[PDB]
Structure 1
């Protein structure tokens, strides 16, 4: 029943967010389409954001089993994109009436033969295709100190990516006295807050350490990076900025992290959250171009790597309408680019002109959104205000019904943006020559279309305090 077919019209390599969106797209445009997703994981397609967020905010002990979570508004949602009975079997796929979408789980595509329109799986199965999407996502970066420390340290280090890592780390959280997160980024900070909340109830320790001066310091300016660090500290987490890891070893049963400044940190387990590299292993056999500067498969405006091979999601190095070649790690991009790839695979020939958004929540009470070029080394103007009662992720989730912020923001850009005639929220403009090239929104929701319009228009702005009024910052 899960026997690989010899041929499929639409082959999707990888079974994450972009592949699911593509399958949906293909099927909407061609209701008899036969679509095979090949997924190296055991699980059917699922979304990632809850893995560092709402799944940790449950008191139900069978969360690890069901992977149902409660949104910030109390409403239950499955991590899976659709119920498992909505897929057809791989065996049935070639000739079942009206086609369908099948998933081969626990199978990895290891070779791509582009001239022959064929892939080979790790078990030796050969599948030919008519149209192919590469949607392989990324592979977490390791830390060189872990790489050089050997197998014992490696075995006590988690690179947090999938359902399996949620399960392993949630178990570690219940069982050990101290966990250290290495990395200042959004994922590391979400995990710090999640683990920190668990630890408060157990009386245990969570450390977050990183070389930057504060959380998300590569992206946020000092004021908001510092504020974030304080929020994380308010959760009980021990945050160690300006920490440069020299080495990691085991000392009488504990991990011992040595920092350049002379500090030594003893802990039971390490989570490394220091980014990823696109999964481009198939470029070798496929002879496909990869981007040496940004990583990822190079694609054209229509997301094509070849006449009949598209790329979407984290794996794609696309041409951003404003910024040129880039890759992102955004749920929004994976949805929109996967949907577009599917449309183009069914004859749309439409260009990828979407401006991808990003969001992060540090619990129900603090959220961020970002769009465009967001880099703390650029000149910035931050405009802040006291928060109102609605300016938090929980309220945004209550109003919209969803915690997936890309859905509630919409994909749209505003049609017009006429300026109308402690701090807890604000807007940060990232600049080039008075032109806004990126925006971070701090506890401001339902305004992403305005931010997109500002950046798309690319006008010079004489007074960004006036522009901030569009974000209800006065």
Structure 2
């Protein structure tokens, strides 16, 4: 099935690989691009899996969702009509994009520009993109809890996880979310709405003092926690899981502070591990500080190999070495890698943006280096802007309920100016003052 040689080989069938395939086709008319994806599904966007897909009857089957504005769209980047078969890819006139699903690259030979698949098939390439993303992390407490507890714990990542958890939300009475990040908070709000109509229970616990405590300042993290609680969620901050067992058929969670939580199903949203397995056979460098494949500003690792997406630890000429795990970063970095695979030699320059929605009432947008450990200055009026500072310069911005102004935030971080009064900068976001 898989051809023996392909000009462009994209490893992984996710957001970064699809953006690169589109970029290659637009930069090199007639290009022949092969995507090798271990998932049986075609490339699809994941943000809807924890948001729009939950705010709707046949969605689990159609996988179509209504944006907050109303326009309906599919979760897949393109219908199967957009793609060509891997068998006909070398022969179709003016080429195309093919996806080899259900196949995993298990070995990478950088010297001979060759990969070996899980079925023994070997494919030679001229240009290669590694876009393997990552796999959800699991807490050690669940790992030493036995098959019973582990069979009742969901690692939310793929379309299959959305379907399995959606079915469980209609069968069990209590679901517990372990994780205070954006994923855990969005799932809490989503399951919260589901539970308000079915009269069930949703619990979210995490070690921080409030939701997204590692991202937003304390005063805003606490505000967000109250918003999640008002969505029908029992939020337990300052909770460190000590052990997990079964008691009376239900899962029993023991916290390091003595508290106990009884539930029927657990959803662990506790971060991501970059998929760097191919670094061994390929002799590729892994970044010790951020994880992932270490690449340069052009996202290049070796002469004919690039890395994009969650798995790429790259050099930001403006902000320093980073590894970003955002949907728009996978699109931007994937688009950039695609251009550099066709001879662009362009560095990461256009800063990708981040967003999060906790329902159609609360909305976040972020750009740059956003970390609660950095010094912050917030200007609010409901809504506001939070500046993240380093060396008296704005390196990150979080827009709270402020939309259609990301270009202004991007320009601020690019100019790298030392602003005397951040209140005047807040006026740029139509805001007319806290610190941490």
Task: Provide TM-score, normalisation by structure 1.
Answer: 0.90
State the Cα distance separating 1:85 from its structure 2 match.
1.3
CA displacement 1:328-378 (0-9 Å, x = unmatched): 111111111111111111111111122221100011111101111211122
Give the secondary structure class of the aligned counterpart of 1:428: strand
Q: Which moved more, 1:17-26 or 1:430-439?
A: 430-439
State the Cα distance separating 1:227 from its structure 2 match.
0.9
Separation in 2, partners of 1:20, 1:434: 38
State the Cα distance separating 1:148 from its structure 2 match.
1.6
Would you say the 8 A contact 1:200–1:236 is kept in 2?
yes
State the Cα distance separating 1:382 from its structure 2 match.
0.8
Separation in 2, partners of 1:55, 1:29: 33
The alignment status of 1:5 with 2:11, answered yes or no, reads: no
Give the secondary structure class of the aligned counterpart of 2:13: coil
Give the secondary structure class of the aligned counterpart of 2:170: helix
Give the secondary structure class of the aligned counterpart of 1:98: coil
Separation in 2, partners of 1:83, 1:376: 40
State the Cα distance separating 1:157 from its structure 2 match.
0.6
Match of 1:24 in 2: 22
Separation in 1, partners of 2:195, 2:245: 24
CA displacement 1:294-336 (0-9 Å, x = unmatched): 0110111211111000111111001122321110111111111
State the Cα distance separating 1:433 from its structure 2 match.
3.9
Equivalent of 1:453, from 408, 411, 419?
A: 411
Would you say the 8 A contact 1:208–1:240 is kept in 2?
yes
Give the secondary structure class of the aligned counterpart of 1:211: coil
State the Cα distance separating 1:124 from its structure 2 match.
1.0
Match of 1:217 in 2: 213
Would you say the 8 A contact 2:114–2:124 is kept in 1?
yes
Separation in 1, partners of 2:272, 2:318: 23
Separation in 2, partners of 1:377, 1:445: 25
Equivalent of 1:326, from 322, 325, 329?
A: 322
State the Cα distance separating 1:434 from its structure 2 match.
2.7
Match of 1:336 in 2: 332
Would you say the 8 A contact 1:434–1:462 is kept in 2?
no
Match of 1:52 in 2: 50
The alignment status of 1:124 with 2:108, answered yes or no, reads: no
Paired residues in the alignment total 431
CA displacement 1:374-396 (0-9 Å, x = unmatched): 11122211111xxxxxxxxxxxx
Match of 2:376 in 1: 380
> Root-mean-square deviation (CA), in Å?
0.9
CA displacement 1:79-117 (0-9 Å, x = unmatched): 000111111111101111111100011111111011111
Would you say the 8 A contact 2:180–2:210 is kept in 1?
yes
The answer for unaligned runs of 5 or more in structure 2 is none
Would you say the 8 A contact 2:297–2:317 is kept in 1?
no
CA displacement 1:379-419 (0-9 Å, x = unmatched): 211111xxxxxxxxxxxxxxxxxxxxxxxxxxxxxxxxxxx
Separation in 2, partners of 1:137, 1:103: 17
Give the secondary structure class of the aligned counterpart of 1:174: coil
The alignment status of 1:439 with 2:430, answered yes or no, reads: no
The alignment status of 1:171 with 2:129, answered yes or no, reads: no
Q: Which moved more, 1:122-131 or 1:374-383?
A: 374-383
Give the secondary structure class of the aligned counterpart of 2:49: helix
Give the secondary structure class of the aligned counterpart of 1:175: coil
State the Cα distance separating 1:259 from its structure 2 match.
0.5
Would you say the 8 A contact 2:137–2:270 is kept in 1?
yes
Q: Which moved more, 1:25-34 or 1:197-206?
A: 25-34
State the Cα distance separating 1:261 from its structure 2 match.
1.2
State the Cα distance separating 1:260 from its structure 2 match.
1.1
Separation in 1, partners of 2:163, 2:51: 13
CA displacement 1:444-471 (0-9 Å, x = unmatched): 0111111122122222222111111111
Would you say the 8 A contact 1:178–1:269 is kept in 2?
yes
Separation in 1, partners of 2:328, 2:43: 16
